[PDB]
Write a structure and sequence with these properties.
Chains A, B: It is found in: Lysosome membrane; Endosome membrane; Early endosome membrane. The structure is a homodimer. Chain A is mainly alpha-helical and about 475 residues long. Chain A has helices at about 5-25, 30, 40-55, 60-70, 75-85, 90-95, 95-100, 120-145, 150-185, 185-205, 235-240, 245-250, 250-270, 275-280, 295-315, 325-350, 375-400, 410-430, 455-485; strands spanning about 355-360, 365-370. Chain A folds into two domains: about 1-105 and about 115-210, MFS general substrate transporter like domains (Growth Hormone, Chain: A, Up-down Bundle); about 230-485, MFS general substrate transporter like domains (Growth Hormone, Chain: A), CATH 1.20.1250.20. The first copy, chain A, is built from 19 helices and two strands. In chain A, strands 1-2 form a two-stranded antiparallel sheet. In chain A, helix 5 packs antiparallel against helix 8, helix 9 (about 150-185) runs antiparallel to helix 15 (about 295-315) and helix 9 packs across helix 17. The first copy, chain A, is globular. At the A-B interface, helix 16 and helix 19 of A face helix 15 and helix 18 of B.
């Protein structure tokens, strides 16, 4: 040990960052749909679709900024400061005492009939998204740099708890903050995430006295020659183009991953959900985000075992040494989880034909089937097993494959390509929704899937996952053969 | 080249042997139900089960004969002689001139009113099964020995066409012979397989003059010490205990393979099958064995593609160099096909609730759904890909991982474990048919599956195949570390 404080200061900062991030996306659409905004509903989702995507587009630029100009520590501080400044807009816009400061005059009782005061909301969203795009891309390698000088095993062990803290913050936000947002006034529900950002900034500032940092280079990106004699830059360029095909092959995996996250909650909305006494009954309601945190909960239990049992056993028998094989195992478990979800949806669609039951979640009535929500546990357990394999291995591969001088940008680029997979999936959902294909044709999310063929969509996702698993296996073998032997 | 005749003489012998083998199992049950036997369905099906039991159980002993007493090449001839002697019984029984010679005089024209010619038919079954068991264990290593002195690539290339010939003989028998036994004179229907056996014996005898044989090693099995000197007999035991777990983990693969092979035909019986002009109409009928040969047809096209395109590309890229990895790839395609079959059956079971069309195949009415049989093409393209990946690789692994002295015995043990897997699959099918689990509860095979749940059975088979794929991948790494690392 000895560097436990430097790891703790990064883990707590990441946890608070994740709590703040899920404090916004969980109920951004519902907050924009009501009281002083009253957007019709189509642009309320557009704001979220722009924020998620500004989170990805600005990640390589933040990585380049923290490698050429800033030292990846001052860059994290600057990103958290802009991130903190953009948080205050939501609590200031939810409180009537300060609403008139950012907006001219809006005191509508309820939505009566362009979009009121947009510039403040869009500025806050832009700053928050650019802060998130930089914080992830820089803190993911920065945290691993503390235990970097102990071999890849220490880095993998650190990334295990890094993802564990990411998921614990997500649960603390989706369960606690989102419940306060939905029932208690929006003011507290948007003041808590701002407090979390402030605490994360304070923790990073306090802990940067034990952090092991590195100075910016500033002459590593200007030497990206593509006209072909300098040395020590060639193998930095060669190792950068060598990993581009690996990142590209991960795009279908990201597509399937994000589409499953999108559709699993929608399917869970149409299952029988038990009511927790006087927590979801009159006059409160069950927050929708509570159905989103099913992946994370199983992760809080899987990662410890995976760090105490699975990893030691695999290392003892020399099984799965490289991260690219762990990614393939995660992709296979993703395919299994998609097939299980399709099997469950096939049974669920045959039950909404006899009888349905109305249930209220987000003050929206859903015609669920007489099938317990806990029948969806097997697919969530499979996807959690996949994420503790694929998600952690992808981060550690993006860490260990990047050049030393070009380290945050490559990790940023990784987070960019994930975003590329997020929007390709949304295009896939709009491709099966055309009149030619009846799959998922009942409008947007949080609607009604009793007339949708979600099981066929799940089977298609599983088939795509299998094909991209084979392609990724081929590319990972062609990468490992060159890396281990030729390099 | 140079040894092209020694390979053709074995390929033609295997083709004729396979044609004779499928000339029996294709219509043995229907033959025992009518004319001289008039057996009940239970005992007629038990006869086929006993025949399979002799085919699988006696293979290791047939291999031990070829290594300890006979010279393999002589063992194949001795087994083929008994095989031919046991084949004449069926044509003799079907012929009215010789039926009285076989047992007494039976004229149960309508089966108005406990086995007739039980000793004759049981001896014919036993000798035929023992001959098949001895041929299979000794024809594959003897065939591969002709090109053994050119490297593993030559052995794999020979096994490709060996499996191609196995499938071509199966198509020639199931398509040609089974049509003759079902619609036209039946005495020639069993006379053709006997002629095939006689031709195979003559071909092997003629090709014995170019065959590269090996001398028997009598003192090879007596050195199986299990208490713990000489040398090179320890290695033969070290390389025998080390391959047992691979076969043990392949047992569930054979389970899934055989159950999936039977249930695919069972489901194909309940799909809309086009009538082929005046070949299946009055007064003839579509042979059921044709619906069994649809897989083998897909094999006659994939092997030429694999031998000329897939194999060179994989070889010139360092992809899939070992047989165990190819077995794993085939096992993955098996669970993909099982999932595809479950998806198709889920749609087929929804259609039979509205409309069912009657069709006649085995002179028996089936209430098929209004869905073309060609929708089975995808699920058959995958098991076609698996067999050209898993079936060939398993044979080449059993050939290459066996000690030089003990080759036929190990090959026979491979088929014995395949039969063990087949019987475990039969037990599994009998397990889901209990009152507690409603899956596949409508009596025996070749019946009505519209009240069954075959999609659930397919999904369970897919899950079992995935689990055994993971297990086989775990053990295959623990075995390949003793091939060129420890050894």
């Amino acid at each position: 040990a000895g560097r436990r404080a430097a790891c703790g200061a990064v883990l707590l900062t990441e946890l608070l960052e994740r709590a703040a991030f899920y404090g916004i996306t969980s109920n951004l659409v519902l907050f924009l749909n009501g009281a002083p905004f009253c957007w019709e509903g189509a642009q309320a989702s557009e704001a979220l679709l722009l924020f998620m995507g500004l989170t990805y587009l600005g990640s390589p630029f933040g990585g380049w900024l923290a490698d050429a100009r800033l030292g990846r520590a001052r860059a994290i501080l600057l990103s958290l400061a802009l991130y903190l400044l953009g948080m205050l807009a939501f609590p200031l816009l939810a409180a009537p005492a300060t609403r008139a400061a950012l907006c001219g005059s809006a005191r509508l009782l309820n939505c009566t009939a362009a979009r009121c005061c947009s510039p403040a909301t869009f500025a806050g969203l832009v700053l928050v998204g650019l802060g998130v795009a930089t914080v992830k891309a820089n803190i993911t390698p920065f945290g691993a740099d503390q235990v970097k000088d102990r071999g890849p095993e220490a880095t993998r062990r650190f990334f295990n708890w890094f993802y564990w803290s990411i998921n614990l913050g997500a649960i603390l936000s989706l369960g606690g903050i989102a419940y306060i947002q939905q029932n208690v006034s929006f003011v507290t529900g948007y003041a808590i995430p701002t407090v979390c950002v402030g605490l994360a900034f304070v923790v990073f500032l306090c802990g940067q006295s034990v952090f092991i940092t590195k100075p910016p280079d500033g002459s590593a990106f200007t030497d990206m020659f593509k006209i072909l004699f300098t040395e020590e830059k060639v193998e930095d360029v060669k190792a950068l183009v060598k990993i581009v095909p690996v990142f590209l092959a991960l795009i279908p995996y990201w597509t399937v991953y994000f589409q499953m996250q999108t559709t699993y909650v929608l399917q869970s909305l149409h299952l029988r959900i038990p009511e927790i006494s006087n927590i979801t009954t009159t006059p409160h309601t069950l927050p929708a985000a509570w159905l989103t945190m099913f992946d994370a909960v199983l992760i809080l239990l899987l990662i410890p075992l995976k760090d105490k049992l699975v990893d030691p056993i695999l290392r003892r028998h020399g099984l799965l040494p490289s991260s690219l094989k762990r990614i393939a195992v995660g992709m296979f478990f993703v395919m299994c989880s998609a097939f299980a979800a399709g099997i469950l949806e096939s049974k669920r669609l045959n039950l909404v034909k006899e009888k349905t039951i109305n249930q209220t979640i987000g003050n929206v009535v859903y015609h669920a089937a007489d099938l317990s929500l806990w029948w969806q546990v097997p697919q969530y357990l499979l996807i959690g097993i996949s994420e503790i394999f694929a998600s952690i291995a992808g981060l550690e591969f993006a860490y260990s494959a990047a050049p030393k001088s070009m380290q945050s940008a490559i990790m940023g680029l990784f987070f960019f390509f994930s975003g590329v997979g997020s929007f390709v999936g949304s295009g896939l959902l709009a491709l099966v929704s055309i009149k030619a294909i009846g799959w998922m044709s009942s409008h947007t999310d949080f609607g009604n899937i009793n007339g949708c063929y979600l099981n066929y969509y799940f089977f298609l996702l599983a088939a795509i996952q299998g094909a991209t698993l084979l392609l990724f296996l081929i590319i990972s073998v062609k990468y490992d053969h060159h890396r281990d032997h030729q390099r």
